[PDB]
Every structure is written in structure tokens, then in C-alpha cells.
Curated annotation (Swiss-Prot):
Lineage summary: Eukaryota, Metazoa, Chordata, Craniata, Vertebrata
Subunit structure, interactors included: Homotetramer. Interacts with PIRT. Interacts with TRPV3 and may also form a heteromeric channel with TRPV3. Interacts with CALM, PRKCM and CSK. Interacts with PRKCG and NTRK1, probably by forming a trimeric complex. Interacts with the Scolopendra mutilans RhTx toxin. Interacts with TMEM100. Interacts with PACS2.
Listed name of the protein: Transient receptor potential cation channel subfamily V member 1
Included range, full protein: 109 to 362 of 839
GO BP: behavioral response to pain; calcium ion import across plasma membrane; calcium ion transmembrane transport; cell surface receptor signaling pathway; cellular response to acidic pH; cellular response to alkaloid; cellular response to ATP; cellular response to heat
Function in brief: Non-selective calcium permeant cation channel involved in detection of noxious chemical and thermal stimuli. Seems to mediate proton influx and may be involved in intracellular acidosis in nociceptive neurons. Involved in mediation of inflammatory pain and hyperalgesia. Sensitized by a phosphatidylinositol second messenger system activated by receptor tyrosine kinases, which involves PKC isozymes and PCL. Activated by vanilloids, like capsaicin, and temperatures higher than 42 degrees Celsius.
């Protein structure tokens, strides 16, 4: 009687990028005593929110849904819980909208998500981002820093490490025990182009680490197996990684 909307109409209007069906659900939610973080607005099997369905169904990397929904959550005071809403299924466990923004390789999206208070240390440790018998599932390091590093996004790494809202902890560790550097080691495949790419990524990561925090020696951080990055590169047979490791440890006596 007063423009009531259910979750399915919300997801539909989000997919087809229709905004007229959203300004009315704004007043609906404002008058229907419920917040957008309730269990009735998430996918009961995966926890997919309207923000996540907007991230999946993107149109040329742009959408008016996502800012409309950000402002609605801002007015609802549920902004922090929605901007950090993660999956609940055992497959995509721990995936947030920031990981999708890193995957789709959009700088403006990452900027808008970080500026709204997204969790920079969100861990995506689902069964998809792990190791198994075949097709491990494109393991990246379970961290947004590791994800931006292994996806060839240097500027995104710089923005994640030097944002004015929540600086990313470069010395952080994932659920497996791999740092950002151990993720760079694991992502190598001994071909030429990827070797040069991981070499440059390592160089820039080490430079930014020595600049932001000169006290932390990230090259001596061990995983849960007690293995240094050099030890990991030796055990996985990453020849070029060993070459660059030892070339950098020979040079720069400081």
C-alpha cells in the first residue's frame, strides 16, 4: 500500500541497473523497522547481499546501484556491516566486495570501497582459495594486498598500503601462513613473463615496505612451516625467484 519491496525485486533492480525501484525501497526500509543487514536480505545459502549482487552484475565496471546502496546503508547506520559483508558458504568463504573490486581490476571501485571503511585485512580463506588434488582454485594469498599483488595491479597495491583511512598491514599473514611475499612466490610458474612480473612486484613490495616501515625485515618472515621466502622458492622449484632473491640480497648492503 506504500511501495513495499522484497529482496527479489531489489536484486532484480540491481541487476538491470534500475534506480526507480530503489528510491521507494529506501522509504520502505526507513519505515519497515528493519536494517539491510538482516538475514532476510542475504542469500540463505551463500550470504550474498545486494552489494555482492551489484558487484557480480556490473555494467562496464560502473553502476548507480552501488552508490545508491552505499548512501542507503549510510542513512541506515548499517554501512560498516554491508561494506564488509562476506560470504558464508564453504566455497567462497570470506569473500567481500573489496575482493571482487580487486578481481575485476577497477581502481575507482577500490577507492570508493576503501574510503567508505572497508576491511582492508579481510581474509578470503574459502575452499576455492586453497590447495587440493586438481585445479587448486587460483590461490592468491587470502588477503586483499596479496590479491592486488598477484593480479598485476601495482597502483592498487600503492593505494591499499597508503590510503588515508586504514593502512594495510604488509607483514600480515593468512590462514595458511603465507605473507604477501609467499603469495608472490606461490604464484610464479617459471615462465619468462611471469618471472619478470613477480620480480618487479617483489621489488616494489620490498621498496614500499622499507619506506613505510624500515624496521620490519619481511624477507625473514616464516610461514606455518617455518620456511623463509627463499626456502619456499627452493621447495617449489621457482628458479627465477631464487635468482632475484639472491641478487637482491647480494646488492643493497643496508
Amino acid at each position: 500500500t506504500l511501495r513495499l519491496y522484497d529482496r527479489r525485486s531489489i536484486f532484480e533492480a540491481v541487476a538491470q541497473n534500475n534506480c526507480q525501484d530503489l528510491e521507494s525501497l529506501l522509504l520502505f526500509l526507513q519505515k519497515s523497522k528493519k536494517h539491510l543487514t538482516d538475514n532476510e536480505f542475504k542469500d540463505p545459502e551463500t550470504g550474498k547481499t545486494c552489494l555482492l549482487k551489484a558487484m557480480l552484475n556490473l555494467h562496464d565496471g560502473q553502476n548507480t546501484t552501488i552508490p545508491l546502496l552505499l548512501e542507503i546503508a549510510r542513512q541506515t547506520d548499517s554501512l560498516k556491516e554491508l561494506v564488509n559483508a562476506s560470504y558464508t558458504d564453504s566455497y567462497y568463504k570470506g569473500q567481500t566486495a573489496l575482493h571482487i573490486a580487486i578481481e575485476r581490476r577497477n581502481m575507482a571501485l577500490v577507492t570508493l570501497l576503501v574510503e567508505n571503511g572497508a576491511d582492508v585485512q579481510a581474509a578470503a580463506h574459502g575452499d576455492f582459495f586453497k590447495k587440493t588434488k586438481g585445479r587448486p582454485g587460483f590461490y592468491f594469498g587470502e588477503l586483499p594486498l596479496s590479491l592486488a599483488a598477484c593480479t598485476n595491479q601495482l597502483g592498487i597495491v600503492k593505494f591499499l598500503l597508503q590510503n588515508s583511512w586504514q593502512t594495510a598491514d604488509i607483514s600480515a599473514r593468512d590462514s595458511v601462513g603465507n605473507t604477501v611475499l609467499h603469495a608472490l612466490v606461490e604464484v610464479a610458474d617459471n615462465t619468462a613473463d611471469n618471472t619478470k612480473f613477480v620480480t618487479s612486484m617483489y621489488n616494489e613490495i620490498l621498496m614500499l615496505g622499507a619506506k613505510l616501515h624500515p624496521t620490519l625485515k619481511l624477507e625473514e618472515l616464516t610461514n606455518k612451516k617455518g620456511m623463509t621466502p627463499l626456502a619456499l622458492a627452493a621447495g617449489t622449484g621457482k628458479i627465477g625467484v631464487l635468482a632475484y632473491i639472491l641478487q637482491r640480497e647480494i646488492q643493497e648492503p643496508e
